[PDB]
């Protein structure tokens, strides 16, 4: 039964992957040797080539991703050889370093041993390798409320935050066999942060806003040809709106719009003044300015949309069906100013792809 | 066959309508007398009460409408008695007047004779009773490009525009029997227009922007209990983003953002400056300011969203399933700053409702 769903997903993936790689004749035999390995072992192992390309296809099939134009240049790191928690830690540390690249961010994925029996070899608890802690107790809100449950979990395991609004969470993951995860504090020299300043408004620094340079999503499962890589953190660079329009602006996140309106010198009294909209623009301007000023890669939502239009064009030209999630592709500011808003997308799920999986904490 | 689909839609509507009206016991007999009239005549006629309430239910079921909180106060004008084109014209003229109400806009619908055999008694060509003409010929673009095909149609029928960017289209509709529609120029005293000025930036008047006060959508079919009112123009007041973020901003409409950026004194050179986003905010501020300054009703998208949240609450409280089209409910500016963005909606079609129908021109 499980042996079957593995085989069908394998046939579909190998065919498409070898087609794209210009190795269509190699299919027949590779497909045969896989079928054998399935019968014998209950699973099969990807070559470096299959895995690298699979990860790339997976990004290409991510309906919600506006940044897909660069799918083919993803930097794939094959860490299926790790066996220990020191290795997992060091691989994660290394991911941060090479992906950050002094600010010239390389879109990178580190791939760990896949699920065996549906049994995890490694299980990463972090939502992102770099994120800020969050604390809610007795009317006191500190840091990122989205990180509240993970922070409280780390604090059960012996970690303690300094309770600034920007405490870096430790790396926390669990190895197969161990009932409890381990956690490792992050070396500050590895983590680039960007202070938020405004190009025109000097007072903007009084808000003492900052964000981390590299978003490294680490809780999603990569699925390639019937193989489940539940631990495979990947990154791109940020689109400014992620920081300025959501992380810093959402009421249930940092909720800074009222403070932003104050430093930019406008009233936050009437809906008709559109002070929130104005706050959002200046904050988003601020974010872009600050990242560029420091040498940390970032894209604005207009450029991002232009790139994604090219992705649409490149897709049709290659004879590939395009898939997308309109509700996630439009940017949270001025979406009607992008072509994305004015067309529709098929939201079908094609594999290889990245998927949600259940959290171990909570 | 047609007699059947009419009966089932009638049973569903009368039941729900009499339930809401507190007349549940009157159903039995009203339903019986309808069934008779169906057998005898092939159709049935709504009472003033059924029709009024039906129009209200139809608005309430409009998935794409953010303004549904006020569904129950819709002002229904019953003009099923018109037989002539002078009557149709005068009813349309009257709609404009009472709905405008010196700027204190009354949400109004005028209801004309429904389709008989699926045969129209009246067929309105205007998309809205008040709209601006549009001209595209030889690299010259004038007025509203969305009105290009209707403008060219009116010009076939003997109308001629002055070719300003704001020529008011004539009312144009066709009566049953007549092979061709008629057109009637709009009396300027009936049409309120609002010049666009900015509260802070005096130079904004140099753009010589204006818009009409009352959007009166006139090409949709109202369906109430199996009866098709193909001619039933209705109106609300504008949400500012409709004018500032779409009509005036869309490249395929008035396309004013570059001009807006110039008068507000910012460069329109780099995506990272977010000059479009900034332009959009000031233009939208300008629109709201100008409507309020003149005494013409308008709502901003934040207030509109707050009202729609109340509509959600009022719906659940009344034990009614809520339906909505997320992609149309979010406003085209700062959607993530409204609760609408952060939840989902069922997009099922419930009748009574308003529907698209095929255009007679084109
Ligand atoms: C290179 C720069 C990239 C940019 C600018 C970019 C941009 C985005 C943005 C803005 C989102 C929406 C995030 C949200 O609203 O929560 C997104 C979603 C996503 N991106 Fe990308 N992305 C990039 C690279 C990548 C890479 C390298 C991968 C994986 C190999 C990836 C996979 C995804 C996935 C899976 C989602 C959806 C996650 C979900 O459903 O919650 N992206 N992308
Ligand atoms: C009272 C103030 C009202 C406001 C502020 C309002 C707001 C809106 C807005 C902003 C839209 C989206 C328009 C677009 O993006 O193209 C919309 C759609 C709609 N509204 Fe309303 N509305 C109001 C009253 C009404 C009334 C009185 C009716 C009918 C009785 C109505 C029926 C609809 C329908 C049918 C649509 C969807 C049209 C389509 O699918 O293209 N609304 N409304
Ligand atoms: C915690 N999850 C259950 C919710 C969740 C998981 C992954 C998510 O990924 C968003 C995402 C993924 C990849 C990205 C790559 C680059 C970029 N700038 N943003 C990116 C943003 C979002 C929400
Ligand atoms: C694939 N296309 C040819 C068909 C198609 C394209 C865009 C579609 O909708 C995009 C869209 C989404 C939201 C909107 C909200 C308001 C508005 N005026 N237009 C809006 C338009 C629908 C169908
Ligand atoms: C020409 N049609 C095929 C496309 C089309 C038709 C009606 C449409 O109605 C939009 C609409 C409808 C009712 C409204 C009521 C109030 C308001 N402020 N806007 C409103 C906007 C939009 C597009
Ligand atoms: C009905 N809810 C309990 C379930 C539910 C609510 C909102 C949902 O999505 C809203 C939504 C739409 C677009 C988004 C784009 C980006 C982002 N970070 N979140 C976004 C969230 C999905 C499911
Ligand atoms: Cl993030
Ligand atoms: Cl309009």
Where in the sequence numbering do the catalytic residues of B fall? 65, 68, 237, 242
Whether residue A242 is found in the same domain as residue A231: no
CA distance A176 to A112: 13
CA distance B290 to B356: 32
User: b/e for B175-194, b at 16 or more Cβ within 10 A?
Assistant: beeeeebbbbebeeebbbeb
HEC assignment per residue over chain A? CHHHHHHHHHHHHHHHHHHHCCCHHHHHHHHHHHHHHHHHHCCCCCCHHHHHHHHHHHHHCCCCCCCHHHHHHCEEEECCCCCCHHHHHHHHHHHHHHHHHHHCCCCEEEECCCCCCCCCCEEECCCECCCECEEEECCEEEECHHHHHHHHHHHHCCCCCCCCCCCECCEEEEECCCCCCEEECCCHHHCCEEECCCCCCHHHHHHCCEEECCCEECCCEEEECCEEECCCCEECCEEHHHHHHHHCCCCCCCCCHHHHHHHCCCCCCCHHHCHHHHHHHHHHHHHHHHHHHHCCCEECHHHHHHHHHHHHHHHHHCCCCCCCCHHHHCCCCCHHHCHHHHCCCCCCCCCCEEECCCCCCC
CA distance A84 to A176: 10
Whether residue B95 is found in the same domain as residue B157: yes
Q: Search chain B and give the residue with CA nearest A256.
A: B337
Whether residue A46 is found in the same domain as residue A21: yes
In a domain, B340, yes or no: no
Residues A336, B273: C-beta atoms closer than 8 Å: no
Query: How far B332 CA lies from chain A's nearest CA (Å)?
Result: 6
Whether residue B162 is found in the same domain as residue B71: no
The continuous run of DSSP H or E covering B222 comes out as: strand B221-224
Whether residue B155 is found in the same domain as residue B203: no
Cβ pair B126, B93 in contact under 8 A: no
Cα–Cα distance list, B157 to B92, B139, B358 (Å)? 20, 24, 20
Whether residue B171 is found in the same domain as residue B204: no
Cβ pair B303, B292 in contact under 8 A: no
Query: How far B200 CA lies from chain A's nearest CA (Å)?
Result: 11
Range of the domain at A173: 81-106+121-192+356-360
Q: List residues bridging with A78 in a β-sheet.
A: A111
CA distance B220 to B354: 6
Q: Which atom of ligand 5 is nearest to the CA of B67?
A: 16
Q: Which ligand is in closest contact with the Cα of A216? A: 3
Q: Cα B191 to the chain's mean position, in Å?
A: 16
At residue A355, what are phi and psi to the nearest 5 degrees? Answer: -130, 155
Q: List residues bridging with B228 in a β-sheet.
A: B223
Q: What is the CATH number of the domain that holds B7?
A: 3.90.340.10
> To the nearest 10°, the Cα dihedral for B75, B76, B81, B84?
60
Plot region of A22 (φ>0 → left; ψ -120 to 50 → alpha; else → beta): left
Active-site option among A20, A87, A193, A242: A242
The reported resolution of this PDB entry, expressed in Å, is: 2.2
CA distance A95 to B150: 59
Q: Per DSSP, which regions of B1-116 are E strands?
A: 75-78, 108-111
Cβ neighbours around B86 below 10 Å, total: 11
User: b/e for B9-30, b at 16 or more Cβ within 10 A?
Assistant: bbbebbebbbeeeeeeeebeeb
Residues B284, A303: C-beta atoms closer than 8 Å: no
In a domain, B350, yes or no: no
At residue A336, what are phi and psi to the nearest 5 degrees? Answer: -65, -10
At residue B329, what are phi and psi to the nearest 5 degrees? Answer: -75, -35
In the block, tokens 């309109």 appear at: A326
Q: List residues bridging with B110 in a β-sheet.
A: B77
In a domain, A321, yes or no: yes
Residues A276, B337: C-beta atoms closer than 8 Å: yes
Whether residue B153 is found in the same domain as residue B268: no
In a domain, B338, yes or no: no
Cβ pair A232, A78 in contact under 8 A: no
CA distance B253 to B269: 21
Q: Which ligand is in closest contact with the Cα of B341? A: 6
| Surrounding residues of ion ligand 8, Cβ less than 5 A | B 215
C-alpha B134 – ligand 6 centre gap (Å) = 39
Helix axes A48-60, A2-20, angle to 10 degrees: 90
Across the interface, which of A271, A276, A281 has its CB nearest the CB of B274?
A281
Length of chain B: 362
Of B135, B155, B160, B137, nearest in space to B145 by CA = B135
> To the nearest 10°, the Cα dihedral for B199, B201, B206, B210?
-30
Q: Which ligand is in closest contact with the Cα of A54? A: 1
CA distance A307 to A73: 14
Whether residue B113 is found in the same domain as residue B226: yes
C-alpha A217 – ligand 3 centre gap (Å) = 6
**Do β-strands A234-235 and A216-217 pair in parallel, antiparallel, or remain unpaired?**
antiparallel
Q: Is A344 in the pocket of ligand 4 (CB under 6 A)?
A: yes
Residues of chain B neighbouring A303 (CB-CB closer than 8 A): 271-272
In total, the C-beta contacts within 8 angstroms joining chain A to chain B are 86
At residue A128, what are phi and psi to the nearest 5 degrees? Answer: -130, 150
Tokens linked to A2 = 């499980």
Whether residue A144 is found in the same domain as residue A101: yes
Residues B285, A292: C-beta atoms closer than 8 Å: no
In a domain, B257, yes or no: yes
In a domain, B50, yes or no: yes
Q: Per DSSP, which regions of B144-220 are E strands?
A: 171-175, 182-184, 193-195, 210-212, 216-217
Residue nearest (by alpha carbon) to ligand 6 atom 6: B343
CA distance A96 to A234: 10
Q: How many domains does chain B have?
A: 3
Cβ pair A197, A205 in contact under 8 A: yes
* All residues at 6 or more sequence positions from A20 whose CB lies less than 8 Å from its CB, including other chains: A53, A57
Whether residue A202 is found in the same domain as residue A174: no
* All residues at 6 or more sequence positions from A297 whose CB lies less than 8 Å from its CB, including other chains: A103, A104, A105, A213, A237, A238, A291
The continuous run of DSSP H or E covering B85 comes out as: helix B85-100
CA distance B218 to B128: 5
B128 secondary structure, DSSP code = B
Q: What is the CATH number of the domain that holds B164?
A: 3.90.440.10
Residues of chain A neighbouring B248 (CB-CB closer than 8 A): none
Q: What angle do CA B158, B162, B163 make, to 5 degrees?
A: 110
Whether residue A203 is found in the same domain as residue A91: no
B355 secondary structure, DSSP code = E
Cα–Cα distance list, A30 to A4, A41, B50 (Å)? 17, 16, 70
Of B96, B328, B124, B303, nearest in space to B213 by CA = B96
Residues A337, B281: C-beta atoms closer than 8 Å: no
In a domain, A340, yes or no: no
In a domain, B337, yes or no: no
Please tell me the number of Cα atoms within 13 Å of A27 on its side-chain side. Answer: 16
User: Residue A17 annotated as binding?
Assistant: no
Cα–Cα distance list, B349 to A57, B168, B236, B352 (Å)? 37, 34, 21, 9
CA distance A242 to A235: 14
Cα–Cα distance list, A212 to A216, B66, B159 (Å)? 10, 37, 62
Helix axes A2-20, A27-41, angle to 10 degrees: 160
CA distance A187 to A89: 12
Question: B326 in contact with A at a CB cutoff of 8 Å?
Answer: yes
Cβ pair A192, A106 in contact under 8 A: no
Whether residue B203 is found in the same domain as residue B320: no
Across the interface, which of B278, B302, B303 has its CB nearest the CB of A281?
B278
Plot region of B48 (φ>0 → left; ψ -120 to 50 → alpha; else → beta): alpha
Residues of chain A neighbouring B336 (CB-CB closer than 8 A): 245-246, 249-250, 332-333
Contacts by B336-342, CB closer than 8 A, 24 or more apart: B336/A245, B336/A246, B336/A249, B336/A250, B336/A332, B336/A333, B337/A249, B337/A257, B337/A276, B337/A277, B337/A280, B337/B302, B338/B301, B338/B302, B338/B305, B339/B305, B339/B309, B340/B66, B340/B305, B340/B308, B341/A332
The H helix count followed by the E strand count for chain B is 10, 16
Residues A335, B337: C-beta atoms closer than 8 Å: no
Of B283, B296, B197, B192, nearest in space to B242 by CA = B283
Active-site option among A60, A65, A131, A154: A65
Length of chain A: 362
Residues of chain B neighbouring A289 (CB-CB closer than 8 A): 272
The continuous run of DSSP H or E covering B298 comes out as: strand B298-299
C-alpha B239 – ligand 2 centre gap (Å) = 9
Of A29, A26, A7, A5, nearest in space to A17 by CA = A26
3-state SS assignment for residue B124: strand
Interface test with A, best of B251, B274, B306 (most A CBs within 10 A): B274
Residues A285, B274: C-beta atoms closer than 8 Å: yes
CA distance A270 to A288: 27
């Amino acid at each position: 039964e499980e042996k079957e769903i593995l085989w069908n997903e394998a046939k579909a993936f190998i065919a498409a992957c070898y087609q794209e790689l210009g190795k269509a004749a190699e299919v027949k035999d590779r497909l045969a040797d896989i079928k054998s390995e399935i019968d014998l072992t209950g699973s099969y192992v990807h070559t470096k080539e299959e895995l690298e390309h699979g990860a790339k296809m997976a990004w290409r099939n991510s309906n919600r991703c506006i940044g897909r134009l660069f799918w083919n240049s993803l930097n794939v790191i094959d860490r299926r050889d790790v066996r220990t928690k020191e290795e997992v830690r060091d691989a994660l540390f290394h991911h941060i370093e090479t992906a950050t690249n002094n600010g010239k961010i390389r879109p990178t994925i580190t791939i760990f041993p896949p699920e065996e029996k549906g049994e995890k070899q490694v299980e990463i608890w972090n939502h992102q390798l770099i994120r800020y802690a969050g604390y809610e107790s007795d009317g006191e809100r500190i840091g990122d409320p989205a990180s509240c449950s993970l922070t409280a979990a780390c604090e059960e395991l012996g970690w303690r935050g300094e309770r600034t609004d920007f405490d870096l969470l430790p790396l926390i993951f669990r190895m197969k066999g161990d009932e409890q995860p381990v956690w490792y504090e992050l070396p500050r020299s590895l983590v680039i942060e960007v202070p938020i300043t405004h190009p025109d408004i000097e007072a903007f620094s009084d808000l003492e806003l900052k964000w981390y340079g590299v978003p490294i999503v680490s809780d999603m499962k990569l699925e390639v040809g019937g193989i489940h890589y539940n631990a495979a953190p990947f990154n791109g660079w940020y689109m400014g709106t992620e920081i300025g329009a959501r992380n810093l602006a959402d009421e249930k996140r940092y909720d800074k719009l009222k403070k932003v309106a104050s430093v930019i010198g406008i009233a936050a009294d009437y809906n008709t003044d559109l002070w929130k909209d104005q706050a959002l623009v200046e904050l988003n301007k601020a974010v872009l300015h600050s990242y560029k000023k420091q040498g940390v890669s970032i894209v604005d939502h207009h450029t991002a949309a232009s790139q994604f239009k090219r992705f649409e064009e490149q897709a049709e030209e290659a004879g590939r069906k395009l898939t997308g999630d309109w509700t996630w592709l439009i940017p949270p500011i001025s979406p009607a100013a992008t072509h994305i808003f004015h067309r529709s997308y098929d939201n079908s799920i094609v594999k290889p792809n990245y998927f949600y999986q259940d959290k171990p904490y909570e």
